[PDB]
Amino acid sequence: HDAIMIVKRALQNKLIVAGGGATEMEVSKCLRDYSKTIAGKQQMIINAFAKALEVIPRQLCENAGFDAIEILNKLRLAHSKGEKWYGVVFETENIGDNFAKFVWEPALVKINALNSATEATNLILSVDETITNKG
Amino acid sequence: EKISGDDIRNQNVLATMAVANVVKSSLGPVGLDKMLVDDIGDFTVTNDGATILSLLDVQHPAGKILVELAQQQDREIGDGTTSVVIIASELLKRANELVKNKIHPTTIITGFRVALREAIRFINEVLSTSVDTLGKETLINIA
Amino acid sequence: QIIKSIAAIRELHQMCLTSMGPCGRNKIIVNHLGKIIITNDAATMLRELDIVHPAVKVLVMATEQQKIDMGDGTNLVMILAGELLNVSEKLISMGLSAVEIIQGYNMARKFTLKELDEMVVGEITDKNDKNELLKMIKPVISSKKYGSEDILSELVSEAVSHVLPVAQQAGEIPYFNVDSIRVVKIM
Amino acid sequence: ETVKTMEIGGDRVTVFKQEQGEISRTSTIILRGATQNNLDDIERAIDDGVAAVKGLMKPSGGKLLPGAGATEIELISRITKYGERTPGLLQLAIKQFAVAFEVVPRTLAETAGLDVNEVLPNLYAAHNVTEPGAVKTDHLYKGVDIDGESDEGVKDIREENIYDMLATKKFAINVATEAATTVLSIDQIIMAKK
Amino acid sequence: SLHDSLSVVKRTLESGNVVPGGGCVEAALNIYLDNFATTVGSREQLAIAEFAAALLIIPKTLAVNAAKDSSELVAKLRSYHAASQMAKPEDVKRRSYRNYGLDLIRGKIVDEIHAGVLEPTISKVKSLKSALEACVAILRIDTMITV
Amino acid sequence: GKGQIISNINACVAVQEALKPTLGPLGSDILIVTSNQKTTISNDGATILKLLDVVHPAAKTLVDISRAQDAEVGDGTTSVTILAGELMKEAKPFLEEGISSHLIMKGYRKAVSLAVEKINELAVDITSEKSSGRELL
Amino acid sequence: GRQAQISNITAAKAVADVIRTCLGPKAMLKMLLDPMGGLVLTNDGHAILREIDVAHPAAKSMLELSRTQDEEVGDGTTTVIILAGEILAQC
C-alpha cells in the first residue's frame, strides 16, 4: 500500500523535478551566470533574487535539527563540481542524491508558487501610500 | 559603567560608520572638501584626507585606531588615507549581518586572515613589469 | 495663505504623479465597508478618500469632468493642475498679484489651443475595422497592468465593433453607448 | 436564436447570445484569472477603454497627436517663442507656462526608474535641431521610452502605435487651467471644526 | 610647473611594480574570491563572500562624486572582469581583454593602461594589510568598561 | 512616499517569522487562540492565516495567495509566503541606495522568465529511453 | 548629509540679507546694536561686515573673501556678496 501511494501522486502530475534543494540551488546558480548580460542595475536585483531562493532549504534544515550554516556551504561545492543532482538528505545530514533515493516532488507546486510570490511582491512594492477608512 | 553583548557591538559599528560617512565625500580627486571648526571658531579648507583625520576630534577607542591607521599610512606611502578607512569600515558594516547569522567572530577574523594571505598571490598574477613600450606609448597619458 | 492652499494639494499631488504612465504604481485604499480596493484611476480613488480641504475638492470636481465627459485624462488633470500651483509660487514671491497670473494663463491657453490644430499629422478614417480600432484603443487600455495590453486589445476592439451598427455617410445620429457593454469576471 | 450553458471559470453558467438575426447593440467581455484584485482593474480599464469610443465622433474624433512625452516637449519650444513676441508683463507668466509642462516627462522618468538627469536633456536635444530649411525634418515623434531593454536612448512612439487623442488632450488643457484658476483666485477661506 | 608634472611620472616609474588603478584591483579580487570561497567551506565561505563584496564600496563611492549612476558602473564592472576570467586559466585568449577600469573625468569605462592611471603594489599590499589589522582589533572587543 | 514601503516590509517579515518554523513536515506548529476561546492547532499555513485575519493589506495579500495555493494545488502554502516575504527583505537595502522600486519589480520579473525556463530543463521526462507506464514508476 | 548644504546657502543669504539695501548710491543707513549699548549708523557696506558676529562658519568665509576685495578696490564689496548670494538661491 505504501508503494501504491507513492506512484499515485506521480501519475496525476507528469511534470516532476528533483527536490531536496537540487532544483533550488541550480536556479540560484544559473541566474548568477546569466547576470553578466543583465549587467547594470538589473544585475544586482536578480543576484539578490538568487540569494532569496535559499530560504526554502534553510528552514527545512533548521526545523529538522541540521545546521543551516554548514549544509549550504557543502551543498554548493558538490552541486557546482561533478554532478548537479546532489541534494540534501532529510534523515542524516550528509551530501546525497535525491534522484538516487527516488524522493520526488511535483514541479507545479514550485511553478505556481514562484509566479504567485513574484506577483504578490510587485503589488506590495508598488504601494507608496495606504489609507484605511473606519467602518 | 560596563556594557557587553551585542549592544556595544552595534554601537562600535555605528560609531565607525559615522566617522566613515564624514570622509566618504573627500575620496578621489573629484571629491568634496570640508571645514574643521575648533573651539576657538577658526577653520580650514583642504581636500587632503590625510590632514583631515589628524585634525578631526573624535572621542572613541576605535576612532583613535583609525587615526593611528591614517598616521601609519602616511609614514609608509601617504596615498589612500581615505580608501584604507572605508575598506576597514565596510567590513564592520557587513559584520552586523553575520551576527544575526550566528557566525562566531573568530571565524569572521580567521576567514579574513585566510582571504588576506590568499589575495597576496592573486596580486602577483595581476602585477607585471612595465610593458607596452613598443608600437605605442602608455607613458604619455600619465602626465 | 496662498502657500498653505498649495501645500494641502501637494500632499495629494505626489500620489497622482506616480499614477499616469505605463510604469505608474497603484495605491491601496481600504473602503469603509471593510474591503480592500486598489485601482489606477484617480477619479475612483478620490471618491473613497476623505478630503476635508475645500481647495482640494476643486481638483476633485475638475477630475470628474475627465471621467464623465471623456474616457481618459483623470491622472493627467491632477498632474497639470498640481504643477501650475508650484510654478506660480515664483511669481508670488516676486510680488505679482494673482490677476496677471490668471490673465497670463488665459493668454497662453489661446496660444496653445490654436497650435493643437497644427499638431495633428494623421487622421483616423473611422473605418471601425478590427485592425484599425487597435490604434486608438491600445493607448487608452495602457498605463494599467502593463504587459497585458496586447491581449486586452483584441477583446475590446471586437466588442466595440459589435456594438457599432453598419451605416455610412450619416454623422447626425449617435451609435455607440457606454452602458451597452457589461464586463463579467469569474475566478 | 441561441441559449446554451457553458463553463466559465470552472462553474456552469447559462450563456445568453445570438448569431446573426435580431441585431443587438449589447456585448459582453468575458474575463478569467486567478487573482481577484487584478480582475477589478482590468474590468475598470475596459470601461475607460470603451469610453474613448464616444470621443471618436464628429467633434475631432479622428485627429490625433503623439503622446508619451512627445507633444509636451514640442509645445515648450512654441510657447517660449510667443514669450518674447508678446510685450508686457505677460512674459513672466508665459515662460512659467511652458515650464509647468516639464512635470509630465519628469514623472514618466521617475516612475520608470530612470534618472532625472538622463531623460530630460535627451528630450531637448531630440526636439531642438538645426535644419538647413524652412520645413521641419528628422523626427518630432520622440517620446519618453520605458527603457529596461534595447540599448540606450528613446525611440519613435509610432513604432508601438501609442498616441494621445486630441479630444482628450485639448479638453484636458481647458480643465487644468480652470482648476488652477479657482485655487489662485481664492485668497481667503473660512472653515469650522469637523 | 613642469617639476610638478614630472614628479607624477618619476615617482610612478620609480617603483618597478605597478598595477592599474581606478578600481581594477578591487574588482579583480572580487572574482577570484568567489571561486575560492567554494573550495574551502567550513563556515568560512560566508566570510570570504562578504570580504569580496566589501571591496566594491571604493568604486561605488567614486561613482557618487562622478554624478554617474553607481548601480550601472559597479554592476557592469563585475561582469566585465568575470567574463575575462573564463579563458584566463586556460592560457589562451581570443576576444578576452583584462584591465577594465573606470574613468571619473569622462564618466565612462575605459582601459586604465591607456588612460595612464597607475599605482604601485607597495601601496596596495600595505593598504589591505593595515585596513584588516585595524578592523580585527575593533571586532575583538566585546565589552567597553569606562571608569 | 518610499517610507511606506519599508513599513510594509516589516509587516511581511512579522508574518514570515511566524511561518518560518512551519516549513516542512517535521517543522513547528503555531498555536492560535481566537477571541471565541476555541484553540486549534494546524500544521498547514492556510488555516493558520485564515484564523489571523490581518487588517494590514500587504499581510492580507500573502493570505489570499496562500488560499489559492491550497485550493487549486494543495501543496506549497507555507513555502509561497516565505519565498514572497524573503524576497521583500532583499529589496529593503536597495531603496536606501536610491534605486527606484519600479526597476526592482521589473528586475524580478526578468529572473522569473529565466527561472521557469530552467525548471522544464531540470525536469525528468523520458521518451527515447524505451520505457513505458510501469518501468518509470 | 544634505543638511549641511542647506546651512551653507542659509548662511550666505543671512549675510546678504543685511546688504540688500546697501547696494548703490541710494543705499540707506543701518543701525547696528552693540552689547555695550553703542550704535553704528554708517551706511558703508564693508565697514559694517567687520563688526558683524556670525555663528555658521560659511558666514566667516564671506567676510574673509570680502576683506580681500576691500583691499584691492574700494567699492563693489557688497556687489560680489549679493551676486554670489543670489546664485545659491536660484540653484
PDB file of N, CA and C in Angstrom, chain A residues 52 55-56 59, chain F residues 9-22 30 49 62 78-79 81-89:
ATOM      1  N   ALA A  52      17.645  35.011  -2.330  1.00  0.00           N
ATOM      2  CA  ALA A  52      16.356  34.860  -1.667  1.00  0.00           C
ATOM      3  C   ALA A  52      15.763  33.472  -1.860  1.00  0.00           C
ATOM      4  N   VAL A  55      16.149  30.507   1.108  1.00  0.00           N
ATOM      5  CA  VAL A  55      15.443  30.464   2.382  1.00  0.00           C
ATOM      6  C   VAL A  55      14.625  29.182   2.509  1.00  0.00           C
ATOM      7  N   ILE A  56      14.229  28.583   1.389  1.00  0.00           N
ATOM      8  CA  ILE A  56      13.441  27.351   1.403  1.00  0.00           C
ATOM      9  C   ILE A  56      14.260  26.205   1.994  1.00  0.00           C
ATOM     10  N   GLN A  59      15.144  26.816   6.187  1.00  0.00           N
ATOM     11  CA  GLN A  59      14.171  26.447   7.211  1.00  0.00           C
ATOM     12  C   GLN A  59      13.927  24.943   7.256  1.00  0.00           C
TER      13      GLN A  59
ATOM     14  N   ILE F   9       7.374  46.172   4.514  1.00  0.00           N
ATOM     15  CA  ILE F   9       8.335  45.073   4.547  1.00  0.00           C
ATOM     16  C   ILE F   9       8.316  44.394   5.911  1.00  0.00           C
ATOM     17  N   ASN F  10       8.322  45.188   6.984  1.00  0.00           N
ATOM     18  CA  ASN F  10       8.286  44.618   8.327  1.00  0.00           C
ATOM     19  C   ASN F  10       6.974  43.892   8.597  1.00  0.00           C
ATOM     20  N   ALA F  11       5.895  44.289   7.918  1.00  0.00           N
ATOM     21  CA  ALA F  11       4.625  43.589   8.082  1.00  0.00           C
ATOM     22  C   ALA F  11       4.685  42.192   7.479  1.00  0.00           C
ATOM     23  N   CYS F  12       5.383  42.040   6.351  1.00  0.00           N
ATOM     24  CA  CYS F  12       5.534  40.726   5.740  1.00  0.00           C
ATOM     25  C   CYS F  12       6.536  39.860   6.491  1.00  0.00           C
ATOM     26  N   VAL F  13       7.571  40.469   7.073  1.00  0.00           N
ATOM     27  CA  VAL F  13       8.544  39.703   7.846  1.00  0.00           C
ATOM     28  C   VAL F  13       7.916  39.195   9.138  1.00  0.00           C
ATOM     29  N   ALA F  14       7.081  40.019   9.779  1.00  0.00           N
ATOM     30  CA  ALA F  14       6.409  39.590  11.002  1.00  0.00           C
ATOM     31  C   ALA F  14       5.516  38.383  10.746  1.00  0.00           C
ATOM     32  N   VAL F  15       4.878  38.332   9.576  1.00  0.00           N
ATOM     33  CA  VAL F  15       4.098  37.155   9.212  1.00  0.00           C
ATOM     34  C   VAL F  15       5.017  36.006   8.809  1.00  0.00           C
ATOM     35  N   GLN F  16       6.153  36.312   8.177  1.00  0.00           N
ATOM     36  CA  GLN F  16       7.073  35.262   7.751  1.00  0.00           C
ATOM     37  C   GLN F  16       7.730  34.584   8.947  1.00  0.00           C
ATOM     38  N   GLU F  17       8.244  35.378   9.893  1.00  0.00           N
ATOM     39  CA  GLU F  17       8.960  34.818  11.037  1.00  0.00           C
ATOM     40  C   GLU F  17       8.095  33.843  11.825  1.00  0.00           C
ATOM     41  N   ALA F  18       6.775  34.035  11.814  1.00  0.00           N
ATOM     42  CA  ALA F  18       5.890  33.059  12.436  1.00  0.00           C
ATOM     43  C   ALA F  18       5.771  31.798  11.592  1.00  0.00           C
ATOM     44  N   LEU F  19       5.805  31.936  10.266  1.00  0.00           N
ATOM     45  CA  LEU F  19       5.655  30.805   9.363  1.00  0.00           C
ATOM     46  C   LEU F  19       6.979  30.147   8.992  1.00  0.00           C
ATOM     47  N   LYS F  20       8.112  30.706   9.421  1.00  0.00           N
ATOM     48  CA  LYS F  20       9.398  30.062   9.156  1.00  0.00           C
ATOM     49  C   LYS F  20       9.509  28.681   9.792  1.00  0.00           C
ATOM     50  N   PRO F  21       9.197  28.479  11.080  1.00  0.00           N
ATOM     51  CA  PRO F  21       9.304  27.122  11.641  1.00  0.00           C
ATOM     52  C   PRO F  21       8.277  26.149  11.091  1.00  0.00           C
ATOM     53  N   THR F  22       7.215  26.629  10.445  1.00  0.00           N
ATOM     54  CA  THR F  22       6.160  25.754   9.946  1.00  0.00           C
ATOM     55  C   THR F  22       6.492  25.121   8.601  1.00  0.00           C
ATOM     56  N   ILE F  30       2.008  26.310  14.901  1.00  0.00           N
ATOM     57  CA  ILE F  30       1.583  27.555  15.533  1.00  0.00           C
ATOM     58  C   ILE F  30       0.291  27.298  16.294  1.00  0.00           C
ATOM     59  N   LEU F  49      -3.363  31.171   8.576  1.00  0.00           N
ATOM     60  CA  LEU F  49      -3.595  32.535   8.113  1.00  0.00           C
ATOM     61  C   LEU F  49      -5.074  32.895   8.101  1.00  0.00           C
ATOM     62  N   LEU F  62      -0.604  38.163   1.266  1.00  0.00           N
ATOM     63  CA  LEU F  62       0.023  36.857   1.423  1.00  0.00           C
ATOM     64  C   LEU F  62      -0.975  35.787   1.847  1.00  0.00           C
ATOM     65  N   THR F  78       2.825  27.121   2.724  1.00  0.00           N
ATOM     66  CA  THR F  78       3.782  27.792   3.596  1.00  0.00           C
ATOM     67  C   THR F  78       4.976  28.326   2.812  1.00  0.00           C
ATOM     68  N   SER F  79       5.400  27.604   1.772  1.00  0.00           N
ATOM     69  CA  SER F  79       6.597  28.000   1.035  1.00  0.00           C
ATOM     70  C   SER F  79       6.361  29.237   0.178  1.00  0.00           C
ATOM     71  N   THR F  81       4.546  31.835   0.939  1.00  0.00           N
ATOM     72  CA  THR F  81       4.594  33.029   1.775  1.00  0.00           C
ATOM     73  C   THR F  81       6.018  33.339   2.219  1.00  0.00           C
ATOM     74  N   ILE F  82       6.795  32.306   2.555  1.00  0.00           N
ATOM     75  CA  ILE F  82       8.180  32.516   2.963  1.00  0.00           C
ATOM     76  C   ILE F  82       9.003  33.057   1.799  1.00  0.00           C
ATOM     77  N   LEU F  83       8.780  32.524   0.595  1.00  0.00           N
ATOM     78  CA  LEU F  83       9.526  32.994  -0.569  1.00  0.00           C
ATOM     79  C   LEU F  83       9.151  34.428  -0.926  1.00  0.00           C
ATOM     80  N   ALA F  84       7.864  34.770  -0.824  1.00  0.00           N
ATOM     81  CA  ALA F  84       7.441  36.135  -1.117  1.00  0.00           C
ATOM     82  C   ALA F  84       7.909  37.110  -0.044  1.00  0.00           C
ATOM     83  N   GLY F  85       7.950  36.672   1.215  1.00  0.00           N
ATOM     84  CA  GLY F  85       8.408  37.553   2.276  1.00  0.00           C
ATOM     85  C   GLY F  85       9.910  37.763   2.254  1.00  0.00           C
ATOM     86  N   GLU F  86      10.673  36.689   2.033  1.00  0.00           N
ATOM     87  CA  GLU F  86      12.125  36.815   1.966  1.00  0.00           C
ATOM     88  C   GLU F  86      12.555  37.664   0.778  1.00  0.00           C
ATOM     89  N   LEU F  87      11.781  37.637  -0.309  1.00  0.00           N
ATOM     90  CA  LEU F  87      12.078  38.495  -1.450  1.00  0.00           C
ATOM     91  C   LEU F  87      11.916  39.967  -1.095  1.00  0.00           C
ATOM     92  N   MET F  88      11.033  40.279  -0.142  1.00  0.00           N
ATOM     93  CA  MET F  88      10.879  41.657   0.311  1.00  0.00           C
ATOM     94  C   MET F  88      12.101  42.135   1.084  1.00  0.00           C
ATOM     95  N   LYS F  89      12.785  41.228   1.784  1.00  0.00           N
ATOM     96  CA  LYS F  89      13.944  41.623   2.577  1.00  0.00           C
ATOM     97  C   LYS F  89      15.129  42.000   1.697  1.00  0.00           C
TER      98      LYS F  89
END
